[PDB]
Amino acid sequence: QSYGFRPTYGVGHQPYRVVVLSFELLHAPATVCGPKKSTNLVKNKCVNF
Amino acid sequence: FKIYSKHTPINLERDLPQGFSALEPLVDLPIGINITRFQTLLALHRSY
């Protein structure tokens, strides 16, 4: 059935854009991961690399 | 899967080359598949 999606429709009938992002963890190495270190570089200091 | 590759220059023109050659991994796909029988295909012309 139809939408219409008029600006004169109610709040229950206005067009809303929805992304339902989903994930699955198979027996494969992970691919969608955030930036791991991504901070900065130093040198010649007693530091934990 | 991790393909090891080499593209060597040879001038001896027989069988297997007699030398020291080493291959390198360049493309890895950790994807997951059982392998039993393989093959390979060649590009040619059926006279078009």
**A29 closest CA partner among B28, B6, B47, B41:** B28
Smallest Cα distance from B33 to chain A, Å: 10
* Structural biology method used: cryo-EM
Closest CA to A14 of A27, A3, A28, A25: A3
Looking at beta carbons, which residues of chain A come within 8 Å of B31?
28
How far is C-alpha A2 from the chain's CA centre? 30
The Cα–Cα gap between A19 and A39 comes to: 30
Phi, psi of A26 (to 5 degrees): -80, 180
Distance from CA of A17 to the nearest CA of B (A): 33
SS3 content of chain A, % helix, strand, coil (to 5): 0, 0, 100
> How far apart (Å, rounded) are the C-alpha atoms in residues A14 and A4?
9
Phi-psi sector, A4: left (phi>0), alpha (psi -120 to 50), beta: left
Beta bridge partners of B2: B28
A chain contacts of residue B32, beta-carbon cutoff 8 Å: 26-28
